[PDB]
Amino acid sequence: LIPTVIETTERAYDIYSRLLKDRIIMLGSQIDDNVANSIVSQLLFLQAQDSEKDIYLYINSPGGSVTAGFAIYDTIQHIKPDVQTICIGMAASMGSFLLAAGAKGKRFALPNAEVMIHQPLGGAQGQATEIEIAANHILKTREKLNRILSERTGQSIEKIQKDTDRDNFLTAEEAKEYGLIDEVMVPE
Amino acid sequence: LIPTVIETTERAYDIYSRLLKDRIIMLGSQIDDNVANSIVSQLLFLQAQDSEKDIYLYINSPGGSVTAGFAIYDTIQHIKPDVQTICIGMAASMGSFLLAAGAKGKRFALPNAEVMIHQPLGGAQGQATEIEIAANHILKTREKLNRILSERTGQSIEKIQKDTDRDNFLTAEEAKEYGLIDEVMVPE
Amino acid sequence: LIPTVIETTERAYDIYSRLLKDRIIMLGSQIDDNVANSIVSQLLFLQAQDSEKDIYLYINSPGGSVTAGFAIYDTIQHIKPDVQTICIGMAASMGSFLLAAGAKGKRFALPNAEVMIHQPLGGAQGQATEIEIAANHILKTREKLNRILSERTGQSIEKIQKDTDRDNFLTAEEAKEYGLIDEVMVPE
Amino acid sequence: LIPTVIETTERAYDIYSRLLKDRIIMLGSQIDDNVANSIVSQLLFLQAQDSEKDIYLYINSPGGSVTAGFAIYDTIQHIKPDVQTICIGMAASMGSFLLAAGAKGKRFALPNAEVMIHQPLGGAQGQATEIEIAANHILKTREKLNRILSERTGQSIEKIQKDTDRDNFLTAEEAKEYGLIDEVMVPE
Amino acid sequence: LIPTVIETTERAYDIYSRLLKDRIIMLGSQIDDNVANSIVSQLLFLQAQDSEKDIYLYINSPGGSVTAGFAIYDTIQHIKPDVQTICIGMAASMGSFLLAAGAKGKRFALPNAEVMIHQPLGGAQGQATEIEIAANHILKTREKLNRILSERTGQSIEKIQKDTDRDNFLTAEEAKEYGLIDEVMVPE
Amino acid sequence: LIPTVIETTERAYDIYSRLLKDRIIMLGSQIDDNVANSIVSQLLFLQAQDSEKDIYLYINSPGGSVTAGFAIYDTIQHIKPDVQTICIGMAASMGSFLLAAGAKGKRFALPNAEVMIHQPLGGAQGQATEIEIAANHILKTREKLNRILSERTGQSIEKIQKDTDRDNFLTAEEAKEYGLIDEVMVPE
Amino acid sequence: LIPTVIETTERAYDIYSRLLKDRIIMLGSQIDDNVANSIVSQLLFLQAQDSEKDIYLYINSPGGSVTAGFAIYDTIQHIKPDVQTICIGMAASMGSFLLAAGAKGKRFALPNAEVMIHQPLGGAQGQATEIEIAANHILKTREKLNRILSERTGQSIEKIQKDTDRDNFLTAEEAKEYGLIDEVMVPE
Amino acid sequence: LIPTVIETTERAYDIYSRLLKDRIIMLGSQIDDNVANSIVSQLLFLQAQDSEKDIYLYINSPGGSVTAGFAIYDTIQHIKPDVQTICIGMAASMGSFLLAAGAKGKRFALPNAEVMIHQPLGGAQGQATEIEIAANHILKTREKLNRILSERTGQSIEKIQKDTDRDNFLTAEEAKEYGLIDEVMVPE
Amino acid sequence: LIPTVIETTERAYDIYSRLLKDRIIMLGSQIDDNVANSIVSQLLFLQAQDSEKDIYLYINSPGGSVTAGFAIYDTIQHIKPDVQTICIGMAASMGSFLLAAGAKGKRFALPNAEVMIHQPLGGAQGQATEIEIAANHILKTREKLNRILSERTGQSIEKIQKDTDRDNFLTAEEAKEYGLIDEVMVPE
Ligand SMILES: CC(C)n1ncc2cc(C(=O)NCc3coc(-c4cccs4)n3)cnc21
Ligand SMILES: CC(C)n1ncc2cc(C(=O)NCc3coc(-c4cccs4)n3)cnc21
Ligand SMILES: CC(C)n1ncc2cc(C(=O)NCc3coc(-c4cccs4)n3)cnc21
Ligand SMILES: CC(C)n1ncc2cc(C(=O)NCc3coc(-c4cccs4)n3)cnc21
Ligand SMILES: CC(C)n1ncc2cc(C(=O)NCc3coc(-c4cccs4)n3)cnc21
Ligand SMILES: CC(C)n1ncc2cc(C(=O)NCc3coc(-c4cccs4)n3)cnc21
Ligand SMILES: CC(C)n1ncc2cc(C(=O)NCc3coc(-c4cccs4)n3)cnc21
Ligand SMILES: CC(C)n1ncc2cc(C(=O)NCc3coc(-c4cccs4)n3)cnc21
Ligand SMILES: CC(C)n1ncc2cc(C(=O)NCc3coc(-c4cccs4)n3)cnc21
């Protein structure tokens, strides 16, 4: 499942860490607190290595937590390096939020990569105690998500609210037309 | 189950990683997000090692997710190296899609290797909320799969739709006749 | 999930440990006894390495135990180094207590980082035997938490009691206005 | 486990219901909401049958919920009939509360029947959300229990508080001396 | 647990059904769809038996579903008979809603019967698909509950909103002062 | 949970069966094959008892299977008696379909009874084998449901398609305005 | 779920048994050995009651075992009475086999009743030991099913083989056109 | 369970990998996709190391999947090196197929090593959807297995069909007489 | 959860082992046989490294076994080095026994560190066979614990017996006043 790579200078790298040497971060799982903590650590590490060179963030996630996604989001915008974004397989739910969060001019996706811009809700525990706040916290988070998405897609807030309410299935071309990505990555 | 190999120059390789040194990627499991993330990382790694030399992708999968399969597909077509394909045991469901996805002129299969070109459906969660989109997403994905397969097999879209709807069992010779593979790999 | 990093001088670091080399402690999980024991060990370690240089504590926790949180709290205040604090994703329950516990002048949070200053109750086992003490232990702990929070936020004890009783959702700007953090960390 | 009894006038009674015909209620289980609802229904039924004749309540409970116990308590005091009380086996926790709750002059217990006057705490769910109320609700319930017990045992509130805090084991003679029961039921 | 009662005229009644003969409905469990369907059937049955005579509804519920509670509520108001209400043990969450729903002038509670007027939320399934409706459905239901409660308690809507947001613990006297019940049922 | 009722002429009825004697069918559960088989048997039974007198169908269902719902639907329309309909608590998903299916002029609902006219999808097993049919079977069933609903509500097919695609929450007044029910059942 | 019906002459019937008094057999579940044994017992019973009068078999089954289905089939053809057939909800898999097995001229189905004429395979245990027989037993059973179906639908064996291989969804009108049923049962 | 071996030149080998250094592959488990993927990787590795020197394949398997077995089979015949075969303990089901698949003149088995040449059937999932293909796929696979076995044992196809249908237990001498192995490996 | 630390001279340490290099033992879990065996091994190791230099034992345990606690106790007193003690978070049950067991003059605790000096009972298995010994073994162990505690706290045995019978909650100041610790560790 996970192979090893070494070189003469010995030097034990895993396949993901060998890619990290070339400033490539791989994200191929649901966005929980654990993976979010790891992705943030890599982004902070690559900045310390070189603050000028670009970072490559490959995405293949079905979704995850909102608070976990914003941790990755804020880190990407906070650091100096321009974080590139390349969607593969699919970018659904919070994965599409990070897809759009890439550096402007450097948001990519492969031809057969699907996209879905709708976050359903978990994390209902802490809110479920009080009524008035629980309902408003959903609205606040909905306003929080739709505002940030609107700025990056470059579309009106009115259109975002309707699309981000129900389920979606955008292709690479449709995602480019929406403004989520900048270019469909043609072969070679 | 998983043996170790080393050499004098010491240098700990697993059997799969020792094959990766000779640009050989082994795929002998169902295509989920985890293995897809690993296969993509290997394809990106081998390109960085040498963009001209060929890659060998041995396949032995019963199937997997559609979105996971396209992640591997798009990566194979995106990179410069010509990815060879050698089917062993069986190539069913999404495994047969990657079988046909190999570089043109370099798609192989061993004599007693079975082939099956039909993807049943999972991943019904995110779609199950809305009705009109859920049904159409199946049609869109069916049109997505059948179009790409038709191009690589070199057959009409009309024939693909019927064959890829129900179950199939093609031998190495029948798969060659279909256009899925280019040659049956004769002993030695 | 967890990648490796090495360098020539060989030297196997995990991503979290490579950050620990630069005096960065990552906290991206619920605060139980296990993680609390690890965080304390890191704080004691970094003090032994250098008692003058600052420590960076990134927080992304939904909460945890009270006794586990105070173990981290007391350690931060006990050691010489000024422990910086940077909230990412969210800082809820006992996470917000450690958020405010950072060195004065060096308490930060990213723009879209949420904050919640209310600890619900677990650890009901040992108290549940006797009645008079169990109830008073909650009051004592409530007085213990609200007193310490009031000092660091710089607000009255009367206001803290009401806010820390029910659920809350403070943004980076609201948390700064409350006195929990000192500055909202602007990009670059 | 549960036998049947009938008579000529046919008339299917279970052993517990045949005793209910002679105004005898059997209580030989932990006091949950289900049994409490049944005991109250029997007390209300026997009152409707005859409001003057006495009721016999045999007790053999290790304990139960506080709110469930008070439902039986209030019902016993509300109805007209003088509810006799006969402890057998043991009367622990809330069982001893109902033991003392019997009609004055008609509280009994057999020679080898144990008694324990201490309620530990469950039902921590609804209280666990808010801190100040949860602790005070224990004190309120402690004041509620100790006040009512003090009136019926005919001892001071100061003595009750100490005894009802920790575990106890009173024999029939000691329970009579305490004031929980009125007489030890001698053979024949 | 459940005894039998018969009489000469033979005639097999359970203890709950024997009470139903005297127009007494017992409610000593959480208010789900099953018990709600049974309670409604009893209310409709007693109306058919006699539309003029009063019905007695004993309550001992920790809570339940909102939609299940309104089914009992609407049925009580729809039928001709004046449904009396007698709280025992506790009336928490939706139980307190039905407690107040009793006929005006005939709402009772025993001395040590607790009351709690706050419904937390379940039934989050059907709403969780769409965002804008899910949050507003909580507000609509909150407006639905608080409006109806305000009319029956005879207090302002402003006071109800605050009390029904967080947890509560009202005694028989406090519940009478609130307007939830009309009289505390004194012994005999 | 389920009480007994008898009378002198002895005659053991359960509460639901006693209502069935007065031509009242209670439906307070999800519509599966088991309850559907029972409801149909009752409808066929009441027709045999008297084909002229009206039947009363009380509804309190969150939903169920489509094929199970149509079994009840077709039976109601097939038999001679005019089946009245009274919604209580809620009528969601397939429950609202049967709500509208009542005899014309005799479709009722209580004041606080909610309504929801959207069927999500299960029963995906038998369809999941073939692709072209599975998607079209959803469209056929959608056309099947929307056509029948449109006739009974008396609105256009265009409006039904949009409303029955996403989630809904109609009150008694809104359901009356929609045409699902004929009158809101006022007290007494 | 299951109500009771009695009458004066006392006489305890369940709703299904009351229908059995009027020669109506209800089938609303998957066809296993247990229900098959019960259905056969009813068919044999109704013959003994009256061998001339017709029997009414209401069907609402998703499918079941082949051997269990043939037990009901053979019994229907063996007995003298003409067994009517009325499909409700759906008649899938082996249910459609019994649907067509009804007396000629008396095979019915309601307007919105679905039909599916394809049996997938279970009961693989006893066959799985030997290879040559296991495969041929499927062919023998396929020849057994298709031959009998062809006779009753009145179509060719060639057409049956293709339709009964893959999944199907026939409406009442299409099932009538196929020859499975004789008439669509119009309202009243 | 699994020991370590190293040598001076340091060099960490597991016991299985140390044998792989001397071109020995150990197979002591059921033949699933995982072990098949590993065995193939070793065969491909040893060919790359030296295409002329022989490989030693020790077998001790009770059986496994057919498709998994053919993956190992085809690989053995495809590569240049003559793969020796030494049966130990037992070679049942698909293990006996690989036993016979060894290089001609180099098929061995120890004195007390049992042999069984019959594959029962699993992998019934993908076939179970369609009837005509499922049965024929068993026949095709039976023809596939019996044809290949007949060639290597050097016996008629008629004899193989009967023996490979039911269970078998051949000793080392009987297996040699059958043609499965070439020689019984005498001590030293 | 557990990070790595290395240095140039390479040298793989875990965070806990890096602290062990500076004679710091971390105890942040319940005291079972496994952790007790590890703690003893560390104490024996640090003595062998240097018998004169002090050892630092950080405690954060809720409790554990008695026999496991005495194993650590006896080891601390047996070895030459003066084992310092620093309580963090909490020191409950057997943790408080080891808290007091520290070298005289070197027993510490942080400001918000709680303390509880009462061991409840497990390990009831081996004793439960014989009656007279089981009860006396509790008394012997109670005399064993209370005697040793009394010596180190420097208080009477009479006071210890009462306090160590029921539950306790001592703060850092109260624990210092009790004699359990020597000083409250002030910041810096
Ligand atoms: C924390 C908890 C309360 N929670 N959890 C999930 C969740 C979702 C929403 C919500 O409004 N989801 C719709 C939505 C907004 O924005 C996007 C997306 C844009 C881009 C990708 S998704 N979808 C609101 N609160 C939510
Ligand atoms: C996304 C979800 C709706 N989903 N999930 C599975 C799945 C399958 C199909 C589908 O196209 N099934 C038929 C088909 C096409 O192409 C192939 C194959 C070619 C080659 C191998 S399989 N089979 C369509 N949607 C699917
Ligand atoms: C075991 C038992 C003693 N226990 N466990 C948890 C817990 C919590 C409280 C309590 O005071 N909860 C409310 C509160 C105070 O202060 C804060 C917070 C400030 C800052 C973040 S949370 N919330 C009281 N007893 C508790
Ligand atoms: C409401 C919930 C938090 N709860 N649940 C149980 C419980 C018990 C007490 C309590 O005071 N327990 C000690 C006690 C007093 O008096 C008796 C008894 C005397 C005689 C019989 S019982 N025991 C306080 N709150 C409790
Ligand atoms: C429909 C679903 C989302 N749901 N489920 C429960 C629930 C509760 C509320 C709510 O308003 N809860 C607070 C409240 C108001 O009024 C009362 C009560 C007073 C008296 C008795 S209860 N509690 C809102 N939506 C809810
Ligand atoms: C057969 C299987 C695939 N299946 N299962 C459920 C299901 C639902 C639909 C569908 O059209 N759902 C939306 C809808 C239309 O009309 C109503 C309703 C109005 C009123 C009550 S329900 N909802 C289509 N296929 C479905
Ligand atoms: C004995 C065991 C191996 N088994 N179990 C199920 C089963 C099904 C078949 C088969 O032929 N299935 C397809 C088929 C033919 O005809 C119908 C039907 C028409 C109408 C109703 S069913 N479906 C063959 N063997 C089967
Ligand atoms: C594809 C799936 C349906 N499947 N799975 C197992 C399996 C087995 C057979 C079969 O022919 N089994 C008998 C047999 C023939 O030859 C040998 C052997 C000789 C020697 C070793 S095995 N056994 C046919 N289909 C099978
Ligand atoms: C051997 C087995 C039956 N067992 N297991 C636990 C246990 C506890 C005791 C006992 O005496 N518990 C009370 C106590 C005394 O002293 C302390 C403590 C002071 C300080 C720390 S603990 N608690 C007696 N036997 C026990």
From Swiss-Prot, chains A, B, C, D, E, F, G, H, I:
Q: Indicate whether Transcription regulation appears among the record's keywords.
A: no
Which GO cellular component terms are attached?
A: cytoplasm; endopeptidase Clp complex
**Under the GO molecular function aspect, what terms does this record hold?**
ATP-dependent peptidase activity; ATPase binding; serine-type endopeptidase activity
User: What does UniProt list as this organism's lineage?
Assistant: Bacteria, Bacillati, Bacillota, Bacilli, Bacillales
**Assembly and interaction partners:** Fourteen ClpP subunits assemble into 2 heptameric rings which stack back to back to give a disk-like structure with a central cavity, resembling the structure of eukaryotic proteasomes.
Q: What is this protein called?
A: ATP-dependent Clp protease proteolytic subunit
Give, as one word, the top-level EC class. Answer: hydrolase
Top-level taxon of origin = Bacteria
Presence of the UniProt keyword Ribosomal protein in the record: no
Annotated keywords: Cytoplasm, Hydrolase, Protease, Serine protease
Q: Which Gene3D superfamilies match?
A: 2-enoyl-CoA Hydratase, Chain A, domain 1
- What Enzyme Commission number(s) apply to this enzyme? 3.4.21.92
Reaction(s) catalysed (UniProt annotation) = Hydrolysis of proteins to small peptides in the presence of ATP and magnesium. alpha-casein is the usual test substrate. In the absence of ATP, only oligopeptides shorter than five residues are hydrolyzed (such as succinyl-Leu-Tyr-|-NHMec, and Leu-Tyr-Leu-|-Tyr-Trp, in which cleavage of the -Tyr-|-Leu- and -Tyr-|-Trp bonds also occurs)
Protein's cellular compartments: Cytoplasm
Do you know which Pfam families this protein is assigned to? CLP_protease (PF00574)
Function, as annotated:
Cleaves peptides in various proteins in a process that requires ATP hydrolysis. Has a chymotrypsin-like activity. Plays a major role in the degradation of misfolded proteins.
- In the UniProt record, the gene name given for this protein reads clpP
Protein family according to the UniProt entry: Belongs to the peptidase S14 family.
Active site per database record = 93 (nucleophile), 118
Q: Which GO terms describe its biological process?
A: protein quality control for misfolded or incompletely synthesized proteins
